[PDB]
Amino acid sequence: DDLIVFYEYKDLGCPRLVYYDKPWKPVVELWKNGIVEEIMNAEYVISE
Amino acid sequence: ALKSMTFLLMLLLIFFYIFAVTGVYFFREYSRSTIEGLEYNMFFSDLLNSLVTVFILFTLDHWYAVLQDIWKVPESSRVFSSIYVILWLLLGSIIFRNIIVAMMVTNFQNIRSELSEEMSHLEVQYKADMFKQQIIQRRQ
């Protein structure tokens, strides 16, 4: 119904920007002790 | 000349208007894309930027490099956009430059025509004056 959402800048940060009707998949990277080492290529899911 | 600029100027500006506002949302995925490495991105961003870049295409400076910088957009078989901008730049540049130079040389043509008819009328009047001088002399 009258659902609301509280954005948290400190936990999340500036959100990504996407547009209407664009086939998009996210890109994610693996971090070992805080240095980029290899991009993800696994089976993964997103949810709300 | 600038008095003679009556309709061709508003034809030029209205063609500029329609083509710029058509090309605003044609290479939309150029400026509105997540590509990190790009340097002509701002050209197609705003409506004023669209006016500036279609004026650049009208002037025809580095259209080659503009096209290669828009080629970083994923090539969708160039079926509508690239042919549209190429046709716009070529047609507008040649048609308007040619129409202005044609009408300016036409202005020079009628300037010389009215000048020549003025000298011809002056010569006819001089011949009539000399003939009437003969008539007057014989009349004494």
Swiss-Prot record, chain A:
Subcellular location, record wording: Cell projection, Cilium, Flagellum membrane
Disruption phenotype: Mice are normal but males are sterile. Male sterility is due to defects in sperm cell hyperactivation and decreased stability of Catsper1.
Expression (tissue specificity): Testis-specific.
Superkingdom of origin: Eukaryota
SUBUNIT field: Component of the CatSper complex or CatSpermasome composed of the core pore-forming members CATSPER1, CATSPER2, CATSPER3 and CATSPER4 as well as auxiliary members CATSPERB, CATSPERG2, CATSPERD, CATSPERE, CATSPERZ, C2CD6/CATSPERT, SLCO6C1, TMEM249, TMEM262 and EFCAB9. HSPA1 may be an additional auxiliary complex member. The core complex members CATSPER1, CATSPER2, CATSPER3 and CATSPER4 form a heterotetrameric channel.
Function summary: Auxiliary component of the CatSper complex, a complex involved in sperm cell hyperactivation. Sperm cell hyperactivation is needed for sperm motility which is essential late in the preparation of sperm for fertilization. Required for CATSPER1 stability before intraflagellar transport and/or incorporation of the CatSper complex channel into the flagellar membrane.
Similarity comment text for this entry: Belongs to the CATSPERD family.
UniProt name for this protein: Cation channel sperm-associated auxiliary subunit delta
Provenance organism: Mus musculus
Gene this protein is translated from: Catsperd
Full protein segment contained here: 556 to 603 of 805
From Swiss-Prot, chain B:
UniProt tissue specificity: Testis-specific.
Gene disruption phenotype: Mice are normal but males are sterile. Male sterility is due to defects in sperm motility unability to fertilize intact eggs. In mice lacking Catsper1, the sperm lacks CatSper2, while in mice lacking CatSper1, the sperm lacks CatSper1, suggesting that stable expression of CatSper1 requires CatSper2 and vice versa.
Intramembrane feature ranges: 46-58
Record-annotated membrane-spanning stretches: 4-26, 79-105
Localization in the cell: Cell projection, Cilium, Flagellum membrane
Residue numbers on the Extracellular membrane side: 27-45, 59-78
Biological function: Pore-forming subunit of the CatSper complex, a sperm-specific voltage-gated calcium channel that plays a central role in sperm cell hyperactivation. Controls calcium entry to mediate the hyperactivated motility, a step needed for sperm motility which is essential late in the preparation of sperm for fertilization.
Summary of subunit composition and partner proteins: Component of the CatSper complex or CatSpermasome composed of the core pore-forming members CATSPER1, CATSPER2, CATSPER3 and CATSPER4 as well as auxiliary members CATSPERB, CATSPERG2, CATSPERD, CATSPERE, CATSPERZ, C2CD6/CATSPERT, SLCO6C1, TMEM249, TMEM262 and EFCAB9. HSPA1 may be an additional auxiliary complex member. The core complex members CATSPER1, CATSPER2, CATSPER3 and CATSPER4 form a heterotetrameric channel.
Family (UniProt): Belongs to the cation channel sperm-associated (TC 1.A.1.19) family.
Protein name: Cation channel sperm-associated protein 2
UniProt organism field: Mus musculus
Residues of the full protein shown: 235 to 374 of 588
